[PDB]
Design a protein around this ligand. Sequence first.
Ligand code: HEC
Ligand code: HEC
Ligand code: HEC
Ligand code: HEC
Length: 107
Amino acid sequence: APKAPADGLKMDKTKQPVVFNHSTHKAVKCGDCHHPVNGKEDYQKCATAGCHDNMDKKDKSAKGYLHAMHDKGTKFKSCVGCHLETAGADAAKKKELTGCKGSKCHS
Ligand code: HEC
Ligand code: HEC
Ligand code: HEC
Ligand code: HEC
């Protein structure tokens, strides 16, 4: 159980970096994102060696970095997956939280 970093955290493993703010996700349990690995919630960087370290856009295994941030039907809600539920039928929120362009993730 480490300490939540300050906002402005830059996820920049790709050419479309995204800023993650812990403050806006205060209502979400730490473990929902820093999920269990070998029985214990893991707080290492998502793309740590052995984790989601493959940058291949088509890798849908546990090694797929982009898969972990965008896809639905995953064991743990991904960024987009959780945002889809949050936005519901609200088209404005869907654009803001799940859009591939013109969203708060990818301008
Ligand atoms: C998802 C909705 C998250 C919630 C809720 C919490 N965190 Fe988080 N955190 C998240 C991401 C996407 C990242 C970036 C990881 C990366 O690959 O760089 C982080 C990062 C951290 C870190 C720093 C990791 C490092 O660089 O070593 C820590 C220590 C951390 N987060 C802690 C933390 C705690 C204690 C939370 C709840 C109280 C918590 N986070 C929630 C995503 C999410
Ligand atoms: C290695 C130590 C990892 C770290 C750090 C993170 N994850 Fe992970 N993830 C890892 C494994 C081995 C697994 C599967 C665990 C299982 O019980 O099956 C996963 C899985 C996910 C998933 C779901 C994948 C799917 O069902 O297709 C997501 C969405 C996911 N992980 C996201 C995620 C994020 C955003 C992380 C950083 C905040 C993160 N994980 C760290 C291994 C490791
Ligand atoms: C739920 C389980 C979530 C996961 C996983 C992630 N996010 Fe999220 N996020 C969530 C909520 C409930 C909200 C607020 C909704 C609203 O209408 O404001 C958000 C908001 C954001 C935002 C906008 C606010 C901001 O910090 O700029 C962004 C850009 C954002 N979230 C990004 C993000 C990323 C990159 C995630 C995975 C790495 C991610 N979120 C996961 C709920 C949840
Ligand atoms: C936040 C909730 C996001 C939304 C909405 C979408 N994406 Fe995303 N994307 C997100 C993260 C956390 C990252 C990684 C940031 C980093 O640099 O580490 C990404 C990355 C991508 C990339 C990589 C670009 C490249 O270099 O090839 C692609 C291709 C991408 N994202 C596509 C994409 C699509 C198709 C989306 C709509 C369905 C979309 N993203 C939304 C977070 C978020």
